[PDB]
C-alpha cells in the first residue's frame, strides 16, 4: 500500500536493504521479501535407547518445507519427514516427527517457549508437551 513520489525509482530502509521497487513497464509499487531460511536442529533420545529422531525448524511456519525438501533432493527419509504425519507449530518454530499431548511433568530436553520433548514408553516414541512447574 505504500506510495512513491513521481521521481522515485526504488525504495530502501534502515540498514540499507532494498525494500521496494517500482516496475518500469507499469509504474506499480512492488515489495521484496527473501525466501524462507533458518537453522535446523535434531532431537534424539540417545543412540543406545533408540534410533528414531524428531527434527525441528527455527522461526519458520512450515507449510512449505516439502518444497524445500524436494529441491534439496536428499534421501527418501527426508521426504518422509516432509509429510504431514505429525506437524506441531510452536513459538520457536514447528516440530516434525513427534505428536503433541497435554499431560505435563518434569522437562527432559529443552526446546523453547516452555516446551520440552521426552521419550515416553507407551510402543515407544518421541513426545512433546508443555512445561510443568510442580504441584
Amino acid at each position: 500500500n505504500k506510495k512513491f513520489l513521481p521521481f522515485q525509482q526504488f525504495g530502501r530502509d534502515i540498514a540499507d536493504t532494498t525494500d521496494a521497487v517500482r516496475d518500469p513497464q507499469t509504474l506499480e509499487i512492488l515489495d521484496i521479501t527473501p525466501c524462507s531460511f533458518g537453522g535446523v536442529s535434531v532431537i534424539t533420545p540417545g543412540t543406545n535407547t533408540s534410533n528414531q529422531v524428531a527434527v525441528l525448524y527455527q522461526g519458520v511456519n512450515c507449510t512449505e518445507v516439502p518444497v524445500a525438501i524436494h529441491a534439496d533432493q536428499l534421501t527418501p527419509t527426508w521426504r518422509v519427514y516432509s509429510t504431514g504425519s505429525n506437524v506441531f507449530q510452536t513459538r520457536a518454530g514447528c516440530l516434525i516427527g513427534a505428536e503433541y499431548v497435554n499431560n505435563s511433568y518434569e522437562c527432559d530436553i529443552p526446546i523453547g517457549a516452555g516446551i520440552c520433548a521426552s521419550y515416553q514408553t507407551q510402543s515407544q516414541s518421541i513426545i512433546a508437551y508443555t512445561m510443568s512447574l510442580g504441584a
Binding site: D13, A113, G114
Partner: peptide, 22 residues
C-alpha cells in the same frame, strides 16, 4: 517489510532464539 529493526536483522541472517521460560 523492512520497517522493523528485528525484521531487517532477520533479513540479514541474524535470528533470535526465544527464552525457554515464558
Amino acid at each position: 517489510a523492512a520497517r522493523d529493526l528485528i525484521c531487517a536483522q532477520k533479513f540479514k541472517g541474524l535470528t533470535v532464539l526465544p527464552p525457554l521460560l515464558t
